[PDB]
């Protein structure tokens, strides 16, 4: 399986890279604001913090609460930012989870396929062996 | 063969052929109906705001009357071909029930109000958008998957009950308000099986003796039950999905 992980892994990490670096300077006014009462401020502060928080969005834990904690930013009619992060989390999570489970069950499929063709070839060889045993017996 | 002269039943069959050629095979009438439904869906989305409503309520009433009368006209046209065939159908029953409820709530006084008028309209929207091809195959197999899903639900709820008998032993009159009432306990265990944010419950039954108490035993029992049930349920769901779609590609 991990040998078969060739291109999908770098596709996953490069989508992570592009989406994280896009979302760095999207909720910039979340961490860079003068609001005293906030507790998810550090999530969107640094580039490494951006990687960690978009990984959190990828894992999809408390995305509701993350969105309400970013709602303390002045709502600019949600025209670009909230739809961007929601689309990113949903698309990335479902597309990558689905693609990995699909390719893993495909790996199981061809494992069983090569196993079954091996037993079929063994059965064909056994039939040929038994037929040649009849041929040899009649040849004596 | 030759058909030197047609008869009355041939004339009736040709009339029914014309009637099913129009409004059932012609894309223009279906496109017009879909356009009207999308326009009133735009008006649906334009609701939840009295600022638009104060100059749109009379137009909303007129378009409600228009969509109701075209729906009952379509139902009458379907009835024209025969009541028996329309009554013995899988989706015309649903459409007839939709238009019957909407018309009764419109003409006769009813407490059905917005919570029935609007979801019935969007149900009709779903029914009409099923007719166009690139959603009908996907919709057809969701309903094909529910008979094989129902047994999974039955097994899940039976295991849920027979493990809630274990649950309700350590429930009731202690660590209460989510473990008591024997229906709130069942639905809270269902929440914990759906498995998101149960550390509120963890802190709820936390600090029994601060070292082991039953805080070890009951917590590990219900934790392994929760993880086994969640894994088995998710696996069975995706298994029924993969079975029925293997059916749709077979």
């Amino acid at each position: 399986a991990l040998k078969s992980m060739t291109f999908l892994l770098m596709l996953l990490l490069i989508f992570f890279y592009i989406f994280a670096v896009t979302g760095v300077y999207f909720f910039r006014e979340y961490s860079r604001s003068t609001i005293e009462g906030l507790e998810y401020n550090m999530f969107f502060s640094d580039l490494l913090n951006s990687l960690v928080t978009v990984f959190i969005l990828f894992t999809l834990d408390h995305w509701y609460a993350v969105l309400q904690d970013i709602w303390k930013v002045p709502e600019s009619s949600r025209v670009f930012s909230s739809i961007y992060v929601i689309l990113w989390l949903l698309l990335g999570s479902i597309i990558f989870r689905n693609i990995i489970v699909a390719m893993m069950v495909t790996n199981f499929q061809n494992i069983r396929s090569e196993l079954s063709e091996e037993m079929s070839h063994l059965e064909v060889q056994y039939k040929a062996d038994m037929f040649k045993q009849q041929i040899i017996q009649r040849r004596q | 063969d030759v058909m030197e002269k047609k008869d009355a039943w041939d004339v009736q069959e040709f009339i029914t052929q014309m009637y099913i050629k129009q409004l059932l095979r012609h894309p223009a009438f279906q496109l017009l109906l879909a356009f009207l439904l999308l326009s009133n869906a735009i008006t649906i989305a334009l609701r939840t705001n009295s600022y638009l409503g104060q100059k749109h309520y009379e137009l909303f009433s007129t378009i409600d009357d228009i969509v109701l009368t075209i729906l009952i006209c379509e139902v009458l046209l379907g009835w024209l071909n025969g009541f028996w065939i329309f009554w013995k159908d899988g989706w015309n029953i649903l459409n007839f029930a939709i238009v019957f409820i909407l018309f009764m709530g419109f003409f006769i006084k009813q407490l059905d109000m917005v919570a029935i008028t609007y979801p019935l309209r969007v149900l009709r929207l779903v029914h009409v958008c099923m007719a166009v091809e690139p959603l009908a195959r996907i919709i057809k197999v969701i309903l094909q998957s529910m008979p094989d899903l129902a047994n999974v639900m039955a097994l899940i709820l039976f295991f849920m009950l027979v493990f809630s008998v274990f649950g309700v032993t350590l429930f009731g009159a202690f660590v209460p308000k989510h473990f008591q009432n024997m229906g709130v306990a069942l639905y809270t265990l269902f929440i914990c099986i759906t498995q998101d944010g149960w550390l509120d419950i963890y802190t709820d039954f936390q600090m029994d003796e601060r070292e082991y108490a039953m805080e070890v035993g009951g917590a590990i029992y219900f934790a392994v039950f929760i993880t086994l049930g969640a894994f088995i349920g998710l696996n069975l769901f995706v298994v029924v999905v993969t079975t029925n779609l293997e059916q749709m590609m077979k």
């Binding site: - | 063969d1 069959e13 071909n81």
Partner: protein, 168 residues
């Protein structure tokens, strides 16, 4: 019932079911007459929809049909269109057929009926069983054993249909 009807010794006889339809209309409207809804607060009385029930039903009882028959007796009968009292249609062959007809909905479900084609004749609608083709031509073969005439299938001649008399 599978063996009783195929022979149809000599004549056949037939009727209509509009009397049934008018019958439940009359029952429904008689129910409507007594203790209907009280919608005087709606500034309207709905007694005239039952008046249309009166009119439609009385007209439907005006269509009485005594025993639609023909000259299908197992002889050299001409299949003249015969009613008790009046007689209308006559013909030397070439008009009486038994034809399969098909109907389709928007989804594409096919429903199969049978019609004894002719000059204002009566159909051969079977009793609420049309989902599969089953055997088709066997009933046509029993009709052929009766007084062999025709068995017409869908669309043109092509194949899979039988004729016995032709006027060329």
């Amino acid at each position: 019932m599978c063996w009783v009807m195929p022979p149809s010794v000599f004549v056949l006889e037939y009727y209509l079911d509009t009397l049934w339809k008018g019958t439940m209309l009359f029952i429904i409207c008689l129910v409507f007459i007594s203790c209907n809804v009280l919608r005087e607060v709606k500034y309207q009385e709905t007694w005239c929809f039952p008046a249309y029930g009166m009119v439609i039903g009385l007209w439907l009882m005006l269509s009485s049909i005594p025993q639609r028959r023909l000259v299908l007796n197992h002889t050299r009968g001409m299949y003249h269109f015969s009613i008790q009292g009046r007689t209308v249609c006559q013909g030397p062959m070439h008009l009486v057929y038994v034809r399969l007809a098909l109907s389709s909905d928007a989804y594409g479900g096919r429903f199969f009926q049978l019609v004894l084609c002719g000059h204002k004749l009566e159909p051969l609608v079977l009793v609420q069983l049309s989902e599969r083709y089953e055997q088709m031509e066997f009933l046509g073969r029993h009709l052929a054993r009766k007084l062999n005439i025709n068995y017409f299938d869908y669309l043109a001649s092509s194949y899979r249909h039988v004729v016995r008399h032709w006027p060329l």
